[PDB]
């Protein structure tokens, strides 16, 4: 009998039509946008949040945002690549493994800028560093891994112990030395 | 925006060796703009048969927040004359003529481009030696090929290089007399004349309307080489200007000798927040438009021309509705 | 246009969140590098031998107990891949899901820097290292030994004698397995550690819920929606109503940023404690009491948790205590200077199947009478407290 | 003040010595650490016992007993320090 | 009277006749203006 159905937060979530078919109501959903930029190579790539790329299009006519224009994506203009973080533009899968990377995309992913005109950045995956593996012998004798060489390294650590001590003349700051304000 | 094309300097104050975000009327980044060309009139060796003009006078464009004009963008370069494609002449700077009207009316023959009693007309004279601004209410004249006259085609302004343009003297009424033939001047209000020096250097002209009055900005007065625009004149126009038109100019040159004329580009001004970099001299060498792209938005956010490498969240795209749905109880039908 | 005059206020909120997220990524990188071991022994089926720690082994990549812990926690997980597509359909909303609400609100949850498989690999490497850490101060040296041998060395350290360990080796393995079996049923509302894991997930959910609730909240306006006020109000009044909504939303974002900064600082200090715990307990047996686990710490195992690291500490608990007469030291009556003191043990009288005043050595951790020998005794200067024996001298005192 | 047995509390590797200098808002600490390299795998024994006397047995102190097949008889046992690989003759000082 | 001296101002601040030993910041002296300089556009007067 009551056509309008509201949630605990008083947002319309359901409606009863004259036709008599109940229709669920969902707010139109925005597409999240993030930009991956490397200052040294001046290379820019766009990651479209968690979208699967069916919704995204190079024109982006369907979705309207305040920003006037998207990144040019000129030259190679490779098609959008689906990744675990989400649909990405300007990234080409390189099948490369890096122990560390300057820019992370998420879950293991890095965007590697091409050396300088510089090419479009290449998607890369972090590789777990593998520790030396020593087998355990079935016999009573036990395998031992022992270094034949040594090196000295210095680890630098800074621990703050103090903060700047500041005393403020509250009367002067508030009134700027004006009698009427005082 | 990187070369700070069409940037109006803040008229309120000057800034030195600082980068700041400023809100002002500014052209869109990457805007091609509207291009208008002036060409020599048709001629037969000794006598020019008729003026050669485009349909700019018929076209009417909204004044909006005002516009910035690129003048003499190409100069001292090989070019082809518009009237004759085969003829090739060195490109020379030309000065644009603008007619601004609060209201627009049809012509006697019903042609567009006619304007109401309140009009502001700016025309260059003496080969661009001087520029004049006057309300000068326009009254149509009845004559062959005239606005109230039969067989009207278009209204134009003309100058003769052989007589009007000379090193010894430049005729300062040649353009004004040509304008008088098309339109009688009645109930004229303020008349302002500004002298212009002669050079082939690129210059920028901007016009905006404010409550105090119409404001005119010229690069030559303060930063001719830079192209930065500083207000040089104030016009006492209090009526809102809603429409503007370009007045075509034809040069009655001898057929044997003709000069190519640089095209002028008009760019609309929109309120925009621009990151502005000020040199020690205080001129704006470079600027950034935050609206054009996500990277520019980041540069404005950190208020720096350099942004460190990283992944930054930016404005999200918003879904656009395909259609509108209305459901309501029936209005009911009257019964016959 | 009203927001444009505010200008930097939105930018400052975005910059503060970006800095906090980068700090969290730095903390994850620093913690895991310390967690990784330079040398490890590869995990094999049956790793452990008589000790059944198969719930720590990875199912061919997470562990079984790690999977159980992640399953029993009520956590709503954002899709990360095609998450927006999943929320496009959604179906009937369940418990105001924050992830579907995030796209409309504009807030977004960033994916964690390390994959579930990546984090599991660090945990698996650490599990291999514990068995082969090396009894003789092998900080830079890895000795690959069976887990059973490592446990016996740790038990010898707690003061249980080696002879008792050999006799009760089957019993020790069975008792250890029962404690590990309890962990599988360990996760419950009663368990404090499980509650802490749930509380951390709840704290993250509350911050997202606050942002969604504030958009619903209306500050000095007819309706929360900017558009709804625009259609029902004239333009001069519209500016005032829009400004009131803008002020409330900006204040909410500023409060949210301050809360996130406080949370990030606490997490960074907590992460440093977790790194110290991994080195102090998981890597090596800890003499300190109660730093890792109650009772005498023997070994520790660490598995990944949704917002942190979950640590399980195996401890030695004494039971059935009995009171026996003991002596500080024993000296020969014939030679007063010659004296012996027990090492990691207490000298005790042996009234069972022996002459009265007979002296035997027992390990401090477990009560077992044993014959006194040079290995369990250290020669010491004579003291008045030390007893003098004229007969039945233990071999060390035999002149 | 003192060498730290705990690993990673002061610095990565095996901490040997630390030097502290003043910093603008705090104290700056530089930690010197021992880093192993060129690791090799060798056969080792938990303990050695005389066949004639089962009771008599020795265990290495801060070291691992290692088989030596280089410039020595087959089945020879040598003592090496845990931190660095050097074959040395077994002696009462290095055995308990 | 707080106005007469800095020490009295401290006593009023803590609202106690006794103030503990220490170094306390007090109102700073402000430089008096020596003179007035005026610069105006030559002529350009409004027409009445």
DSSP per-residue codes, C300-315: EEEEE-SSSEEEEEEE
d(CA B320, CA C103): 14
Regarding beta strands B61-62 and B67-71, do their DSSP bridges make them parallel or antiparallel, or are they unpaired? unpaired
Query: Beta strands of B45-118 (E only): which ranges?
Result: 47-50, 61-62, 67-71, 78-80, 88-92, 98-101, 104-105, 114-115
A178 to chain E: which residues are within 8 Å by CB?
A: none
d(CA C245, CA C215): 9
* Cα B289 from chain centre: 22
Phi and psi angles of residue B261, each rounded to the nearest 5 degrees, phi first: -115, 130
Assess contact for A62 and A29: CB atoms under 8 A: no
| D7 vs C134, C136, C279: nearest CB | C279
| A29 vs C104, C108, C145: nearest CB | C104
Flag if A69 and B327 touch (Cβ within 8 Å).
no
**Residue B69 class from Cβ within 10 Å (0-12 exposed, 13-18 middle, 19+ buried)?**
buried
Can you give the C-alpha Rg of chain C in angstroms?
32
Flag if C22 and B302 touch (Cβ within 8 Å).
no
- Interface contact A95, partner D, CB < 8 A: no
**Residue B122 class from Cβ within 10 Å (0-12 exposed, 13-18 middle, 19+ buried)?**
buried
D41 to chain A: which residues are within 8 Å by CB?
A: 134, 143-145
Instruction: Name the residue in chain C with its Cα closest to that of D63.
Output: C136
DSSP structural state of residue B170: B
Buried b / exposed e across A128-150, counting CB within 10 Å, b at 16+? beebeebebeeeeebbbbbbeeb
**DSSP of B6-52:** TPBPPSS----S-EEEEEEEEPPTT---EEE--EEPEEETTEEEE--
d(CA C29, CA C397): 59
Assess contact for C298 and C317: CB atoms under 8 A: no
d(CA B261, CA B194): 22
Flag if C129 and A30 touch (Cβ within 8 Å).
no
- Deposited resolution, Å: 2.5
Inter-CA distances, B222 with B122, D94, E38, Å: 21, 91, 27
Assess contact for B262 and B37: CB atoms under 8 A: no
Regarding beta strands D63-68 and D76-81, do their DSSP bridges make them parallel or antiparallel, or are they unpaired? antiparallel
Flag if B315 and A65 touch (Cβ within 8 Å).
yes
Which residues pair with residue C348 across a beta bridge? C326, C360
Q: Map C255-273 to HEC letters.
A: HHHHHHHHHHHHHHHHHHH
Specify the experimental method: cryo-EM
Q: How far does the CA of residue D92 sit from the closest CA of chain A (Å)?
A: 22
B29 to chain A: which residues are within 8 Å by CB?
A: 68
Inter-CA distances, B124 with B8, B131, B158, B322, C24, Å: 22, 5, 11, 51, 65
Q: Nearest-5° angle of CA A100, CA C21, CA A159?
A: 80
Which residues pair with residue B186 across a beta bridge? B137
**DSSP of A70-133:** -----TT-PPPEE-SS-EEES-EEEEEEES--SSEEETTEEEEPPP--PPPPEEEEE-PPPPEE
- Interface contact C21, partner B, CB < 8 A: no
Q: Which two tokens stand for residue B193?
A: 């004349």
């Amino acid at each position: 009998q009551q056509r309008f159905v509201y949630d605990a937060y008083q947002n319309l979530v359901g409606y009863y039509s004259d036709d008599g078919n109940y229709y669920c109501l969902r707010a139109c959903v925005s597409v999240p946008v993030s930009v991956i930029y490397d200052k040294e190579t001046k290379t820019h790539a766009t990651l479209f949040g968690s979208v699967a790329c069916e919704h995204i299009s190079s024109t982006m006519s369907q979705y309207s945002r305040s920003t006037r224009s998207m990144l040019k994506r000129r030259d190679s203009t490779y098609g959008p690549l689906q990744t675990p973080v989400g649909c990405v533009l300007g990234l080409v899968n390189s099948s490369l493994f890096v122990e560390d990377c300057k820019l992370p995309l998420g879950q293991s992913l890095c965007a590697l800028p091409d050396t300088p005109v510089p090419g479009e950045m290449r998607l890369a995956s972090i590789a777990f560093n593998h520790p030396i593996q020593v087998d355990q012998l079935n016999s009573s004798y036990f395998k031992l891994s022992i270094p034949t060489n040594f090196s000295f390294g210095v680890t630098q650590e800074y621990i703050q112990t103090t903060i700047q001590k500041v005393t403020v003349d509250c009367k002067q700051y508030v009134c700027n030395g004006f009698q009427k304000c005082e | 925006v990187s070369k700070a094309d069409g940037i109006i300097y803040p008229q309120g104050r000057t800034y030195s060796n600082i980068t700041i975000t400023y809100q002002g009327l500014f052209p869109y980044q990457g805007d091609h703009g509207d291009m208008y060309v002036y060409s020599a009139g048709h001629a037969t060796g000794t006598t020019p048969q008729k003026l050669f003009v485009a349909n700019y006078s018929q076209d009417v464009k909204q004044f909006a927040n005002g516009f910035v004009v690129r003048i003499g963008a190409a100069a001292n370069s090989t070019g082809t004359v518009i009237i004759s494609p085969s003829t090739s002449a060195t490109i020379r700077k030309i000065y644009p003529a603008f007619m601004l009207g609060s209201s627009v009316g049809n012509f006697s023959d019903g042609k567009m481009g006619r304007f109401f009693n309140h009009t502001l007309v700016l025309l260059p004279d003496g080969c661009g030696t001087l520029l004049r601004a006057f309300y000068c209410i326009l009254e149509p004249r009845s004559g062959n090929h005239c606005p109230a006259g039969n067989s009207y085609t278009s209204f134009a302004t003309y100058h003769t290089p052989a007589t009007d343009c000379s090193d010894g003297n430049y005729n300062r009424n040649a353009s004004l007399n040509s304008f008088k033939e098309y339109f009688n001047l009645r109930n004229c209000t303020f008349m302002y004349t500004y002298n212009i020096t002669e050079d082939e250097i690129l210059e920028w002209f901007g016009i905006t309307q404010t409550a105090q009055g119409v404001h005119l900005f010229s690069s030559r007065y303060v930063d001719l080489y830079g192209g930065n625009m500083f207000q040089f004149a104030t016009l006492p126009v209090y009526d809102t200007i809603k429409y503007y038109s370009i007045i075509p100019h034809s040069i009655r040159s001898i057929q044997s000798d003709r000069k190519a004329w640089a095209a002028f580009y008009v760019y609309k001004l929109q309120p925009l927040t621009f990151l502005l970099d000020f040199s020690v001299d205080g001129y704006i060498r470079r600027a950034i438009d935050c609206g054009f792209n996500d990277l520019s938005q980041l540069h404005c956010s950190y208020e720096s021309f350099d942004v460190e490498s990283g992944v930054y969240s930016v404005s999200s795209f918003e879904a656009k509705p395909s259609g509108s749905v209305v459901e309501q109880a029936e209005g009911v039908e009257c019964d016959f | 246009q009203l927001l444009r005059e505010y200008g930097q206020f939105c930018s400052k909120i975005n910059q503060a969140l970006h800095g906090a997220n980068l700090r969290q990524d730095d903390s994850v990188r620093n913690l895991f590098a310390s967690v990784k071991s330079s040398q490890s022994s590869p995990i094999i089926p049956g790793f452990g031998g008589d000790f059944n720690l198969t719930l720590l082994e990875p199912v061919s990549a997470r562990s079984a107990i790690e999977d159980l812990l992640f399953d029993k926690v009520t956590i709503a997980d954002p899709g990360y891949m095609q998450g927006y597509d999943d929320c496009m359909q959604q179906g009937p909303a369940s418990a105001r899901d924050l992830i579907c609400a995030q796209y409309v609100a504009g807030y977004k949850v960033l994916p964690p820097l390390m994959d579930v498989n990546m984090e599991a690999a660090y945990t698996s490497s650490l599990l291999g290292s514990i068995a082969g850490v090396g009894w003789t101060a092998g900080l830079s040296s890895f000795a690959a030994i069976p887990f059973a041998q490592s446990i016996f060395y740790r038990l010898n350290g707690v003061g249980i004698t080696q002879q008792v360990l050999s006799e009760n080796q089957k019993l020790i393995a069975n008792k250890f397995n029962q404690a590990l079996g309890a962990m599988q049923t360990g996760f419950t509302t009663t368990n404090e550690a499980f509650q802490k894991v749930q509380d951390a997930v709840n704290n993250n959910a509350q911050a997202l819920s606050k942002l969604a609730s504030e958009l619903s909240n209306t500050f000095g306006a007819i309706s929360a929606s900017i558009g709804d006020i625009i259609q029902r109000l004239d333009p001069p009044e519209q500016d005032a109503q829009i400004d009131r909504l803008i002020n409330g939303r900006l204040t909410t974002l500023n409060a949210f940023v301050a809360q996130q900064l406080v949370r990030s600082e606490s997490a960074a200090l907590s992460a440093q404690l977790a790194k110290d715990k991994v080195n102090e307990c998981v890597k090596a047996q800890s003499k300190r009491s109660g730093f890792c686990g109650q009772g005498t710490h023997i070994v520790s195992f660490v598995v990944n948790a949704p917002n942190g690291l979950y640590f399980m500490h195996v401890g030695y608990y004494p039971s059935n205590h009995i009171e026996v007469v003991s002596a500080y030291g024993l000296c020969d009556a014939a030679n007063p200077t010659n004296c012996i003191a027990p090492v990691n043990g207490y000298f005790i009288k042996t009234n069972n199947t022996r002459i009265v005043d007979e002296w035997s050595y027992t390990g401090s951790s477990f009560y077992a009478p044993e014959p006194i020998t040079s290995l369990n005794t250290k020669y010491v200067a004579p003291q008045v407290t030390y007893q003098n024996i004229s007969t039945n001298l233990p071999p060390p005192l035999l002149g």
